[PDB]
Amino acid sequence: GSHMSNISLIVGLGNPGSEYAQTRHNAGFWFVEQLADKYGITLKNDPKFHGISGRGNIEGHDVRLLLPMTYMNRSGQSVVPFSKFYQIAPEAILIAHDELDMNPGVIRLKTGGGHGGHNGLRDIVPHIGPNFHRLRIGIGHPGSKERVSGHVLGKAPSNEQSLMDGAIDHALSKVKLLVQGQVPQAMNQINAYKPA
Ligand SMILES: [Cl-]
Ligand SMILES: [Cl-]
Ligand SMILES: [Cl-]
């Protein structure tokens, strides 16, 4: 199983299919796919856990990566059984997700808290509790609430995409701290990111 607060499972939230791959609600997929390429972790089909998943070495630590293929609001149907099967406690999980309550180009590491309205996190917290870590990738808010599906399922304009891409890149550089259990330092260094 996992061991303490060394991060050993990194989940990226999103929806499957080409039609959703560039949408804001796939920000977590972007981060995990980029992380997998950085470290040479193969993301392969994982039908048992309704996802795409991988396993490999990050900086001397055995780490698993998971992209649920459930659709966002059923993400727990992948995350929960996967984490349970591999005996990964919440404290060793990082979930990367889009965050409506933060600007494009803002990124933060958070431990605990609720779903903040995010329909993927909403499907996970009831089962494993809140005590996992989150990489909150700011995407902005559309203003109004009847309109959240339109914003998160949109493809950001180029300036906003560039801001998110820079924040994600910064966070990739801090995964070494996370897999080493240096959550406080990683939090400080991630949360200090500015785009310019
Ligand atoms: Cl959705
Ligand atoms: Cl935060
Ligand atoms: Cl969160």
Short mmCIF file of N, CA and C in Angstrom, two decimals, residues 9-15 25-29 32 66 68 70-80 90 93-102 108-139 148 152:
data_model
loop_
_atom_site.label_atom_id
_atom_site.label_comp_id
_atom_site.label_asym_id
_atom_site.label_seq_id
_atom_site.Cartn_x
_atom_site.Cartn_y
_atom_site.Cartn_z
N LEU A 9 -0.37 7.98 -5.56
CA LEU A 9 -1.39 7.91 -6.58
C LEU A 9 -1.70 9.33 -6.99
N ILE A 10 -1.59 9.59 -8.29
CA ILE A 10 -1.93 10.88 -8.86
C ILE A 10 -3.06 10.67 -9.86
N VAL A 11 -4.20 11.27 -9.57
CA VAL A 11 -5.40 11.15 -10.37
C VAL A 11 -5.60 12.45 -11.13
N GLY A 12 -5.96 12.36 -12.41
CA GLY A 12 -6.39 13.52 -13.15
C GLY A 12 -7.84 13.36 -13.52
N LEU A 13 -8.66 14.38 -13.22
CA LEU A 13 -10.07 14.34 -13.53
C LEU A 13 -10.35 14.93 -14.92
N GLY A 14 -11.39 14.40 -15.55
CA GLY A 14 -11.78 14.82 -16.88
C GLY A 14 -12.85 13.93 -17.43
N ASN A 15 -13.25 14.24 -18.67
CA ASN A 15 -14.17 13.44 -19.44
C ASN A 15 -13.44 12.76 -20.60
N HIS A 25 -12.69 21.47 -18.16
CA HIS A 25 -12.97 20.44 -17.18
C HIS A 25 -12.01 19.26 -17.25
N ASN A 26 -11.16 19.25 -18.29
CA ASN A 26 -10.10 18.27 -18.46
C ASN A 26 -8.76 18.74 -17.97
N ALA A 27 -8.67 19.85 -17.21
CA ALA A 27 -7.40 20.35 -16.76
C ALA A 27 -6.59 19.29 -16.01
N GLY A 28 -7.26 18.46 -15.20
CA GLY A 28 -6.55 17.41 -14.50
C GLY A 28 -5.94 16.37 -15.43
N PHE A 29 -6.66 15.97 -16.47
CA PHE A 29 -6.07 15.13 -17.52
C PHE A 29 -4.82 15.76 -18.08
N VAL A 32 -1.88 15.28 -15.68
CA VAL A 32 -1.41 13.91 -15.52
C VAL A 32 -0.80 13.38 -16.79
N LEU A 66 -3.78 7.76 -12.64
CA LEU A 66 -5.09 7.32 -13.03
C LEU A 66 -5.86 8.43 -13.67
N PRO A 68 -9.75 8.55 -14.76
CA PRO A 68 -11.03 7.88 -14.88
C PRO A 68 -11.62 8.09 -16.28
N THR A 70 -14.93 7.27 -16.84
CA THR A 70 -16.30 7.11 -16.37
C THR A 70 -17.28 8.21 -16.80
N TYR A 71 -16.72 9.30 -17.29
CA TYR A 71 -17.35 10.63 -17.29
C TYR A 71 -17.18 11.25 -15.91
N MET A 72 -17.08 12.57 -15.89
CA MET A 72 -16.65 13.27 -14.70
C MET A 72 -17.49 12.97 -13.46
N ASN A 73 -18.81 12.96 -13.60
CA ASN A 73 -19.67 12.83 -12.43
C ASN A 73 -19.75 11.40 -11.91
N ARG A 74 -19.03 10.49 -12.54
CA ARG A 74 -18.92 9.11 -12.07
C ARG A 74 -17.46 8.76 -11.74
N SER A 75 -16.63 9.78 -11.52
CA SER A 75 -15.20 9.57 -11.32
C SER A 75 -14.92 8.62 -10.16
N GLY A 76 -15.74 8.66 -9.10
CA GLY A 76 -15.48 7.76 -7.98
C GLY A 76 -15.62 6.30 -8.35
N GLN A 77 -16.35 6.00 -9.42
CA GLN A 77 -16.47 4.62 -9.86
C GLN A 77 -15.14 4.03 -10.37
N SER A 78 -14.18 4.90 -10.64
CA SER A 78 -12.81 4.49 -10.93
C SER A 78 -11.89 4.68 -9.72
N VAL A 79 -11.87 5.91 -9.15
CA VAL A 79 -10.91 6.26 -8.12
C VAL A 79 -11.04 5.37 -6.89
N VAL A 80 -12.31 5.16 -6.45
CA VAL A 80 -12.53 4.43 -5.20
C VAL A 80 -12.04 2.99 -5.29
N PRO A 90 -6.11 7.92 1.43
CA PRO A 90 -6.30 9.27 0.88
C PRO A 90 -5.12 10.19 1.07
N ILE A 93 -2.84 10.35 -1.85
CA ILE A 93 -3.46 10.63 -3.14
C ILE A 93 -3.40 12.10 -3.43
N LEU A 94 -3.03 12.43 -4.67
CA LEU A 94 -3.15 13.76 -5.24
C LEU A 94 -4.15 13.70 -6.35
N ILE A 95 -5.19 14.56 -6.32
CA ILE A 95 -6.15 14.66 -7.40
C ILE A 95 -6.03 16.03 -8.03
N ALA A 96 -5.66 16.05 -9.32
CA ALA A 96 -5.59 17.27 -10.10
C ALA A 96 -6.93 17.53 -10.75
N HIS A 97 -7.41 18.78 -10.64
CA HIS A 97 -8.71 19.14 -11.17
C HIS A 97 -8.77 20.60 -11.48
N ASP A 98 -9.67 20.95 -12.42
CA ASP A 98 -10.02 22.34 -12.68
C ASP A 98 -10.72 22.94 -11.48
N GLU A 99 -10.42 24.23 -11.26
CA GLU A 99 -10.96 24.96 -10.10
C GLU A 99 -11.60 26.25 -10.61
N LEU A 100 -12.94 26.32 -10.50
CA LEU A 100 -13.74 27.45 -10.98
C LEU A 100 -13.45 28.68 -10.10
N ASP A 101 -13.05 28.48 -8.82
CA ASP A 101 -12.91 29.57 -7.90
C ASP A 101 -11.53 30.19 -7.95
N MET A 102 -10.70 29.89 -8.96
CA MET A 102 -9.39 30.48 -9.08
C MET A 102 -9.16 30.92 -10.54
N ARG A 108 -2.94 25.92 -6.96
CA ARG A 108 -2.72 25.74 -5.53
C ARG A 108 -2.78 24.26 -5.19
N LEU A 109 -2.03 23.89 -4.19
CA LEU A 109 -2.09 22.59 -3.56
C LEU A 109 -2.87 22.71 -2.27
N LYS A 110 -3.92 21.92 -2.11
CA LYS A 110 -4.79 21.95 -0.96
C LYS A 110 -4.92 20.57 -0.39
N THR A 111 -5.01 20.44 0.93
CA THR A 111 -5.30 19.20 1.57
C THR A 111 -6.64 19.35 2.23
N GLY A 112 -7.53 18.42 1.98
CA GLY A 112 -8.83 18.50 2.61
C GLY A 112 -9.80 19.47 1.93
N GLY A 113 -10.96 19.69 2.62
CA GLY A 113 -12.06 20.49 2.10
C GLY A 113 -13.02 19.68 1.29
N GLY A 114 -14.13 20.35 0.88
CA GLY A 114 -15.18 19.69 0.15
C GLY A 114 -14.92 19.73 -1.36
N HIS A 115 -15.99 19.49 -2.11
CA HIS A 115 -15.89 19.45 -3.56
C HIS A 115 -15.92 20.85 -4.18
N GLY A 116 -16.34 21.89 -3.50
CA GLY A 116 -16.36 23.22 -4.08
C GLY A 116 -17.25 23.29 -5.30
N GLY A 117 -18.27 22.41 -5.38
CA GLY A 117 -19.15 22.40 -6.53
C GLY A 117 -18.68 21.54 -7.69
N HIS A 118 -17.48 20.96 -7.61
CA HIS A 118 -16.90 20.19 -8.72
C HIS A 118 -17.55 18.83 -8.77
N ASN A 119 -18.17 18.47 -9.90
CA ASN A 119 -18.96 17.27 -9.98
C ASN A 119 -18.14 15.97 -9.98
N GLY A 120 -16.82 16.07 -10.25
CA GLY A 120 -15.97 14.92 -10.11
C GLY A 120 -15.59 14.66 -8.67
N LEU A 121 -15.11 15.72 -8.00
CA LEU A 121 -14.80 15.58 -6.57
C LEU A 121 -16.05 15.15 -5.80
N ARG A 122 -17.23 15.63 -6.21
CA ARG A 122 -18.49 15.30 -5.54
C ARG A 122 -18.74 13.80 -5.52
N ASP A 123 -18.20 13.07 -6.50
CA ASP A 123 -18.37 11.63 -6.60
C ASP A 123 -17.30 10.84 -5.86
N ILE A 124 -16.31 11.55 -5.29
CA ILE A 124 -15.16 10.90 -4.67
C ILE A 124 -15.20 11.08 -3.13
N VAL A 125 -15.36 12.31 -2.68
CA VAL A 125 -15.33 12.61 -1.24
C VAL A 125 -16.30 11.74 -0.42
N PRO A 126 -17.51 11.42 -0.90
CA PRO A 126 -18.40 10.63 -0.05
C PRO A 126 -17.83 9.27 0.32
N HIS A 127 -16.94 8.73 -0.51
CA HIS A 127 -16.45 7.38 -0.36
C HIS A 127 -15.14 7.31 0.42
N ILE A 128 -14.18 8.14 0.05
CA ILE A 128 -12.86 8.09 0.68
C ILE A 128 -12.64 9.20 1.70
N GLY A 129 -13.61 10.10 1.86
CA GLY A 129 -13.42 11.24 2.73
C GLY A 129 -12.60 12.31 2.05
N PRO A 130 -12.36 13.40 2.80
CA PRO A 130 -11.78 14.59 2.22
C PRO A 130 -10.26 14.64 2.28
N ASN A 131 -9.61 13.75 3.01
CA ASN A 131 -8.22 13.97 3.39
C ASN A 131 -7.21 13.59 2.31
N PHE A 132 -7.54 13.73 1.06
CA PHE A 132 -6.59 13.67 -0.03
C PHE A 132 -6.18 15.08 -0.44
N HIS A 133 -5.06 15.13 -1.16
CA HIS A 133 -4.49 16.37 -1.65
C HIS A 133 -5.08 16.68 -3.03
N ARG A 134 -5.18 17.97 -3.31
CA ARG A 134 -5.73 18.43 -4.57
C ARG A 134 -4.80 19.43 -5.20
N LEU A 135 -4.58 19.26 -6.52
CA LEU A 135 -3.92 20.28 -7.32
C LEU A 135 -5.02 21.02 -8.04
N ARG A 136 -5.32 22.23 -7.49
CA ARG A 136 -6.43 23.05 -7.96
C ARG A 136 -5.90 23.95 -9.07
N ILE A 137 -6.33 23.65 -10.29
CA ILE A 137 -5.84 24.32 -11.50
C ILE A 137 -6.90 25.37 -11.86
N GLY A 138 -6.61 26.66 -11.61
CA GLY A 138 -7.63 27.67 -11.87
C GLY A 138 -8.07 27.71 -13.33
N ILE A 139 -9.38 27.81 -13.52
CA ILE A 139 -9.96 27.94 -14.85
C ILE A 139 -10.87 29.18 -14.96
N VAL A 148 -22.52 26.90 -15.46
CA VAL A 148 -21.23 26.26 -15.16
C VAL A 148 -20.87 25.19 -16.21
N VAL A 152 -17.20 25.05 -18.15
CA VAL A 152 -16.22 24.00 -17.93
C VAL A 152 -16.10 23.13 -19.15
#
